[PDB]
Amino acid sequence: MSAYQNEIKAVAALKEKNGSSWSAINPEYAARMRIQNRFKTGLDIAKYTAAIMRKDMAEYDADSSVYTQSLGCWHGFIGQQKLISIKKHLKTTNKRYLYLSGWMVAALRSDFGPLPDQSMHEKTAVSGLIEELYTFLRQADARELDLLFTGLDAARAAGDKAKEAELLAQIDNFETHVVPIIADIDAGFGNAEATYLLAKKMIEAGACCIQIENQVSDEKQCGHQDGKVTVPHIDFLAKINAVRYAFLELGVDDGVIVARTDSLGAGLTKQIAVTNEPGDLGDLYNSFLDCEEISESELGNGDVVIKREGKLLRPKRLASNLFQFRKGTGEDRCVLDCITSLQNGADLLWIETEKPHVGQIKAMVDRIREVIPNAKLVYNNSPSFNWTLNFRQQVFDAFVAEGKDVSAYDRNKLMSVEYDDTELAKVADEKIRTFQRDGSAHAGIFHHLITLPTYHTAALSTDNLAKGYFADEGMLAYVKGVQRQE
Amino acid sequence: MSAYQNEIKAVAALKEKNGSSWSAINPEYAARMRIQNRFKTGLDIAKYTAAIMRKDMAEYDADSSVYTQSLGCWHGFIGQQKLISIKKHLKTTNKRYLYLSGWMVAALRSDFGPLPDQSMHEKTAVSGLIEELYTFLRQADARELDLLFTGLDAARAAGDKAKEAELLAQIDNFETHVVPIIADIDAGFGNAEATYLLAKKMIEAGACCIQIENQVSDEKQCGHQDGKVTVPHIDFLAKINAVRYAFLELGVDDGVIVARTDSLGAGLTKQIAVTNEPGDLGDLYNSFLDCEEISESELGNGDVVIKREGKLLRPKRLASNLFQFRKGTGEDRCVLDCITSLQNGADLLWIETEKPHVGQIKAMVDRIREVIPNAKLVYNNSPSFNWTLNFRQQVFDAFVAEGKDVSAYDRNKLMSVEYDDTELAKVADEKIRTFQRDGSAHAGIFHHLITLPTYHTAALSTDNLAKGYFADEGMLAYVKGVQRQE
Amino acid sequence: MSAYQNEIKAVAALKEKNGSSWSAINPEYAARMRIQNRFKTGLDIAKYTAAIMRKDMAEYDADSSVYTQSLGCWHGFIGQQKLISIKKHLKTTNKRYLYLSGWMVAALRSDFGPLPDQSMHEKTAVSGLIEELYTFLRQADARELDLLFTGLDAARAAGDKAKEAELLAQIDNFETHVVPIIADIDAGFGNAEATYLLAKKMIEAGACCIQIENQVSDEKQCGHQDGKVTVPHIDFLAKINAVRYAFLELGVDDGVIVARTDSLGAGLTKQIAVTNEPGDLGDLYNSFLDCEEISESELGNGDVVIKREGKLLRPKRLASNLFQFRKGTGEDRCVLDCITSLQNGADLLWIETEKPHVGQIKAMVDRIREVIPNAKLVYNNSPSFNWTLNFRQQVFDAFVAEGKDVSAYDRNKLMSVEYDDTELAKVADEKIRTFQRDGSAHAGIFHHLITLPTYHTAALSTDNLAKGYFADEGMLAYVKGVQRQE
Amino acid sequence: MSAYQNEIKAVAALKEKNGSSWSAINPEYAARMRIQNRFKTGLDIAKYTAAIMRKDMAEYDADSSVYTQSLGCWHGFIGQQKLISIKKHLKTTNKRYLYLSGWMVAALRSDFGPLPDQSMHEKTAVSGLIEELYTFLRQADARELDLLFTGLDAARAAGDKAKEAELLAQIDNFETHVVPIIADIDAGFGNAEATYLLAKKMIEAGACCIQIENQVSDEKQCGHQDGKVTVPHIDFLAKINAVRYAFLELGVDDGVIVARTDSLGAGLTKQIAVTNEPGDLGDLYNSFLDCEEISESELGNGDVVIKREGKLLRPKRLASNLFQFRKGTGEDRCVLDCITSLQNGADLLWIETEKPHVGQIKAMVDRIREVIPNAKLVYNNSPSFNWTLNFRQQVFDAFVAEGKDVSAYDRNKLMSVEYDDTELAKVADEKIRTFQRDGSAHAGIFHHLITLPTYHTAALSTDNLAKGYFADEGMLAYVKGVQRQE
Ligand SMILES: [Ca+2]
Ligand SMILES: [Ca+2]
Ligand SMILES: [Ca+2]
Ligand SMILES: [Ca+2]
């Protein structure tokens, strides 16, 4: 028997048990409400979506062409219209997820108004947006099912048996708009206990996947090129553990943790790591510090020094009480971070990079996979990269191997108003088009997202309408720009 | 002295008064924060914007070409990007307002998820959105002023006196993003006391203008063409009075009330109005009831009858306990509604119509203005009208006067895939382009809005990106669709 | 195996399945978190508590001495301390519920500040308080279980096997603080669809029982003694049905609906009920109208008249457009209301009375039970009754039967500073003490509550401390008044 | 002219200006609404209350008997009933403030449910409670004024001119329930920018006084007796500056900053302070570190050492990466903290102590006042001190000076069931009663508060009712315990 039939039977039995006092209750109508509300709680969503993500991860492991994608959405309505569009044009939700952007929560969803991306807003805005996204996806299910039940009644009123049968099949095979979300928790908005508390609220809202990072965003030195600040592994691993316990408490056994490393762009640290024996994680972290040998006499009062390899050394230290890593150690620290995360409870990796470059990320993933062979990445196709410059430049240098042409193209004015229609341009655009496929084939990327794309699409579409409506076009700007497209 | 200078002086004096304990306080830095926060409370916004709207109403009275416009915005970020676009392209905020759409609050901003437009959501979502819109507009001011103060410091560091002087002038003449809002309160979300309470919260959030309606939206009969339900004038006038007292309590002497009538599409009423003498408002309302003379013997048990003009008559009554107005009385009731509103405390009118038709609205406004000569309308350029059909049809019939052509155009397939490039089409589009101007010149329209335009622009722009990104275009859909435009 | 053991086994198996990457996860620690979070969602609470209430209703049906009690609580902390006190002193939660007072939500929990009890506040404050109450009860469970697991670890560290065994038994037999709540939804905060929407949110928050009323609180005439306003049964029954569908959609098959009638104190109605044949519910409702025969000539213009029993009659009508019921029909209308509710989907009754009087309520319940023999009441032991006056007066008149004494007691100054120690006083206090038992034995009362008792206890306890602390007692007022008691 | 008269005149003039369309507006009624809403925004409250606190601080400086008091309140209703009680019994609000307890926000007001006092909850709960407290105080004003205007109308209806005149005087001299609040911001819930953002929201809600602390509450080692963790002065001073800029931006020139030091119970620090020359604040902070001289050969790999007074020393360091201060340096660090705070922008001090002991606090204040002679304290009369033990013990040892008795009293069983009626007990209670007066006379205490007293009073009063109501007393527990007192 179908889910719909089973629910009609179930409500009819309650009606019978309760007798004539329930005479006004219509069992088929109640059944439709039940079918229209498949996911009654956020934890039901979290368990359902966790299983989907685990299946997708296994299918990617078997075939690197079968990867997953998402766009960051800053409101339930934006997520809803994205999933409606996916179903309309692409016919299945399979391999499409939501992304919860901490940047967009800070920029758009705080009671404080727009804030920078430093975990300064009220942390309930994060869990609030997850719940909102799933409320809107569940309502999209309910509306489409209601339309199907309306057509079912119309088929019945016309005695059309074939159409009734096709609609009942569409109802039984209905594809929910509810999909997995990768939810950004920043660094947990506090210590490990605070991380657990927030993760728990995010999972109760429906999240099957939590992304957590090893940086201290509120200590960035904007005046330094690599001004981000990392914590020792023990601090970050404790937060991974806190997120795991939130999943476990709630019964989401399959919950997914994405460990993000910011080490590539982080030249600083607040702490010197505790170390108990040489070669352990504390010692490895401290090994990257930029030190100098200063005689005990040449040392300033209050200077801080560390014993490394039998000598007392002075790590370079800013006025802000931050210590510096040696230049050029970003990649090495990322690889250590990532291996350590997968060895200690993370499920997926995120390496924050400064440009979209398949070879660069492949190099790091190859080093990681010589230790953890199926290590999988979530990759931010960042909206703050200038994709055209990066890729025309990338295709320029790919020429220089046997690129005859080279001299015909400057390399400094490549991004231009008009280098269009050139081979470098059509090829650059093709490399952009295949970037995700190529990174998933060669650099272990399981999931491709853009963090804040719908910030820009909402701004642009508002500007494009306002620009006409308030000026000579008046209502024609709306009719042409909006009404004619839909 | 400029506002900026005055604030530097003011903070320097406090620093001096407090002595060396305030040595770390930088008076110019504090002054910039004060300049960046011109509107410290919502009531400061409400008073500032009320004066703007009153000025605009006076300028429209003197010159019908000088009208005002707004688009409905469903989030602070959408309102913010609209005002940023206005300033970028059109160089002034003058004559541009915000509109708070009750439909979009119901559809998008409730803790219940999407709801129909029946005042069923939590009413604090309405005031919450007003505050959010003004938080985002105030932040846009702060960000642009911060950029100007940054350029001021750079001019000073370069010893560039002319540029320093130009920037100080740009700071002193800065045009705020804060503009008036026309805020939809539906029918007040309750009785007159409840209306006052909500209005007060909306005005405290910054609203200088409240739009209130005479319908009972939660009693619509969707099964009737003119299924809306009105209340007797005494009920509606009490709510106008409640809104006035909220403005007065808060000191917003100049607050604006828009009285919306739904009578054109309302064929029903729940109440029979109390009347004390013939010809008063109660009697006029009841005069429009659709009655029939039934002998006391021919009357059903429990039937309800009214004495009109010396006879007992039975008003037509639905099973839902609603009474029917005579067909064709919509316009007459609208004119009575509107005259009554302006005679009893409203400032502006809104006549809800079923199509964008200048002659139709002019006819009603002419009747109103023979009593109230400067009566002014707020006109919803409704997004649910098919603008192309309506206006090609309107231009078809404008031909038929001496429109030779007529026979060359069907009138039933006018809206078409390809009647484009015809004279009827180019002319229809021109009529759309000039619709607002023409209605403001001929039909007393002070303000033109669209209620839910940014619902559609957000949906469309999300669909247009998703359609490519998740299919073969991948990142090229974002680079082309988004990054290349901005 | 115990729940605790089963959860340790379950987490150990996941740890084994996942391998050394989960080495830091402690299965017993995770198991404790699971035991400490028995009720992971509000719907789990609603189903658990609904079964308790159904069991209690059956046990009351078998034995009228086994009734249930609650106190209204206005904050999660108040509910929590009530349940902690119950467990400490009375050793079981059995037969004790929570009550959610709509009056206290209006007075205390609105974003508007204190409001009168007219459903004018934001309706999400109602569901919000249910969730808060259950959050605090769940946290009380977690804290007490954490203390038991701490003692378990201490027993183990001391090698005390008997104590370890007793603590494991206390953990396996732990009695949750989570109990049923009777949740006031007023009249649904809107129409039937709105009622469904709010009920659904209240049930998702944990409520197994919803109390809904047939009055229109925002139309009370405070200037009339019996100034409340009722709706026809069809309107109220539609709202009962809406609440049932919310329970059914959510899978809370056992959900309980309390139908409250306000007819005893309601002399008015806004509507004249639709009636299709004599004797139906519409006709019965209209039968109670106070009408007068006026000749068609003697009738005012616009007067409204109804055909009852072959004649045209004019129901008495206020300027407010409300119709009057005949005096002395309150009880008859209550009995009709109640029978109708139980015949059409309600589970329990609430008859709002003007004084605590067992005989008065028994009279109505006897009439109801001659139709519905097991009809059960929820009875508000109202805090706005003067219990001492009512009951000394009640005991005075119980004397007058063969009460010799009568002359020794005035009857007008009975409530007095000093009629204490009299037989009338000690007996009046005893009648108060046994009031609930007696009403449950003789008047069908399944549940006794007080609506807003913790409003008064919080006010009193704050006043009693402030009165001393800020005056000569200083810190001694706190030490004596607070610290010495606990 | 009175405020009331002036407002009647003001509204009558608007009515006249607007003409007959405002005929329904009653100017006296509107005037009453204005009088009933004296404080239209939180910033109006903050400026009004800041001036009160500054006046009180000056009056305390002139006379140490004129000090101020508050009780922590966890809900607007609790604060409201406290101020109502003050006005009823003590006839003026003068010298009584509110206290906003961060502990009670964590324990009671978070969306997460009860949390420990570690700034882990959503920070908007803090500002939310300030706004709620002032909403309830403003409503208490409105209700009492409404009662006075009702009596005014009754006097007029009786032609009683003397009573009309007395009521108008009571209206013109009405004492608002709105008083200053000392608002706990913990350590700012983040860095200095985050502190500013939250302070701004708290001041906009009405707070004229912000209390900020130098500890890192989320790093406490509960396993250490003095397990709190401090930050170097530069970090704390930056947060003082952030709070000052919030006051200044908002125009609250008179805003008060309370700098709380936790150094007395803090034996740890996460950071070693940056120092530029000997004797500066960084060097002074580091001077308190507990170091040991270890030969470069005897040092572990990765050990951290500091140069102090020409030698390399190893500060004691926990596995948690925290450094230890020398035992017995708590008082010295408190005195440095406090002097530094008043020298760098704080207005008042708070020294967190472990027992209520006038001599102990006087000792520290004397050291502070030899540098800052009018330094003033806010003193927490902590509810977690056992006041009876501490003070019977204090009075026991005050005997031992020439206390003959000594031998008659043990000193270990002093707190007892029955040492009552002894001279030590009556004297201990008298010392408790005069503790605040004595500390204000001898130890510079301007303000005495209890942090979480209404947590306990609400728990106790709920338990005391539940204990009877649910057991044999039934309704008599409410009538006796509640109804008879009020
Ligand atoms: Ca992030
Ligand atoms: Ca509306
Ligand atoms: Ca109620
Ligand atoms: Ca604190």
mmCIF file with all atom_site columns, N, CA and C and ligand atoms in Angstrom, chain A residues 99 101-103 117 184-187 211 213 215 260, ligand 1:
data_model
loop_
_atom_site.group_PDB
_atom_site.id
_atom_site.type_symbol
_atom_site.label_atom_id
_atom_site.label_alt_id
_atom_site.label_comp_id
_atom_site.label_asym_id
_atom_site.label_entity_id
_atom_site.label_seq_id
_atom_site.pdbx_PDB_ins_code
_atom_site.Cartn_x
_atom_site.Cartn_y
_atom_site.Cartn_z
_atom_site.occupancy
_atom_site.B_iso_or_equiv
_atom_site.pdbx_formal_charge
_atom_site.auth_seq_id
_atom_site.auth_comp_id
_atom_site.auth_asym_id
_atom_site.auth_atom_id
_atom_site.pdbx_PDB_model_num
ATOM   1  N  N  . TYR A 1 99  ? 24.229 25.567 1.067  1.00 0.00 ? 99  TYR A N  1
ATOM   2  C  CA . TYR A 1 99  ? 25.362 26.000 1.879  1.00 0.00 ? 99  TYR A CA 1
ATOM   3  C  C  . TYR A 1 99  ? 24.904 27.152 2.782  1.00 0.00 ? 99  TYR A C  1
ATOM   4  N  N  . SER A 1 101 ? 26.229 30.176 4.697  1.00 0.00 ? 101 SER A N  1
ATOM   5  C  CA . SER A 1 101 ? 27.394 31.051 4.705  1.00 0.00 ? 101 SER A CA 1
ATOM   6  C  C  . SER A 1 101 ? 27.422 31.870 5.986  1.00 0.00 ? 101 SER A C  1
ATOM   7  N  N  . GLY A 1 102 ? 28.442 31.652 6.817  1.00 0.00 ? 102 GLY A N  1
ATOM   8  C  CA . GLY A 1 102 ? 28.609 32.501 7.977  1.00 0.00 ? 102 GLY A CA 1
ATOM   9  C  C  . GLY A 1 102 ? 28.830 33.950 7.608  1.00 0.00 ? 102 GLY A C  1
ATOM   10 N  N  . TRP A 1 103 ? 29.498 34.202 6.475  1.00 0.00 ? 103 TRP A N  1
ATOM   11 C  CA . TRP A 1 103 ? 29.702 35.568 6.014  1.00 0.00 ? 103 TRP A CA 1
ATOM   12 C  C  . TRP A 1 103 ? 28.357 36.256 5.767  1.00 0.00 ? 103 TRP A C  1
ATOM   13 N  N  . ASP A 1 117 ? 32.693 39.680 9.059  1.00 0.00 ? 117 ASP A N  1
ATOM   14 C  CA . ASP A 1 117 ? 32.667 38.221 9.216  1.00 0.00 ? 117 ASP A CA 1
ATOM   15 C  C  . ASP A 1 117 ? 33.658 37.783 10.296 1.00 0.00 ? 117 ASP A C  1
ATOM   16 N  N  . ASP A 1 184 ? 28.099 26.344 8.162  1.00 0.00 ? 184 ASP A N  1
ATOM   17 C  CA . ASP A 1 184 ? 29.260 27.041 8.692  1.00 0.00 ? 184 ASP A CA 1
ATOM   18 C  C  . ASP A 1 184 ? 29.030 27.447 10.136 1.00 0.00 ? 184 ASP A C  1
ATOM   19 N  N  . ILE A 1 185 ? 29.862 26.938 11.032 1.00 0.00 ? 185 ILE A N  1
ATOM   20 C  CA . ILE A 1 185 ? 29.801 27.319 12.443 1.00 0.00 ? 185 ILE A CA 1
ATOM   21 C  C  . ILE A 1 185 ? 30.993 28.205 12.829 1.00 0.00 ? 185 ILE A C  1
ATOM   22 N  N  . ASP A 1 186 ? 31.753 28.673 11.842 1.00 0.00 ? 186 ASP A N  1
ATOM   23 C  CA . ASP A 1 186 ? 32.953 29.503 12.060 1.00 0.00 ? 186 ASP A CA 1
ATOM   24 C  C  . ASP A 1 186 ? 33.900 28.692 12.930 1.00 0.00 ? 186 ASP A C  1
ATOM   25 N  N  . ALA A 1 187 ? 34.432 29.255 14.011 1.00 0.00 ? 187 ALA A N  1
ATOM   26 C  CA . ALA A 1 187 ? 35.236 28.520 14.981 1.00 0.00 ? 187 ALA A CA 1
ATOM   27 C  C  . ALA A 1 187 ? 34.433 28.089 16.206 1.00 0.00 ? 187 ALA A C  1
ATOM   28 N  N  . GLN A 1 211 ? 30.660 22.659 9.381  1.00 0.00 ? 211 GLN A N  1
ATOM   29 C  CA . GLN A 1 211 ? 31.985 23.099 8.929  1.00 0.00 ? 211 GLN A CA 1
ATOM   30 C  C  . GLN A 1 211 ? 32.593 23.995 9.994  1.00 0.00 ? 211 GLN A C  1
ATOM   31 N  N  . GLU A 1 213 ? 36.400 25.714 11.712 1.00 0.00 ? 213 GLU A N  1
ATOM   32 C  CA . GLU A 1 213 ? 37.688 26.234 11.236 1.00 0.00 ? 213 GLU A CA 1
ATOM   33 C  C  . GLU A 1 213 ? 38.671 26.452 12.381 1.00 0.00 ? 213 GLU A C  1
ATOM   34 N  N  . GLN A 1 215 ? 40.914 28.981 12.616 1.00 0.00 ? 215 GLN A N  1
ATOM   35 C  CA . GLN A 1 215 ? 41.389 30.348 12.745 1.00 0.00 ? 215 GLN A CA 1
ATOM   36 C  C  . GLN A 1 215 ? 40.703 31.064 13.908 1.00 0.00 ? 215 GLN A C  1
ATOM   37 N  N  . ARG A 1 260 ? 37.884 22.847 8.302  1.00 0.00 ? 260 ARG A N  1
ATOM   38 C  CA . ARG A 1 260 ? 38.467 23.861 7.452  1.00 0.00 ? 260 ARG A CA 1
ATOM   39 C  C  . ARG A 1 260 ? 39.786 24.335 8.051  1.00 0.00 ? 260 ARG A C  1
HETATM 40 CA CA . CA  E 2 .   ? 32.960 30.862 8.356  1.00 0.00 ? 1   CA  E CA 1
#
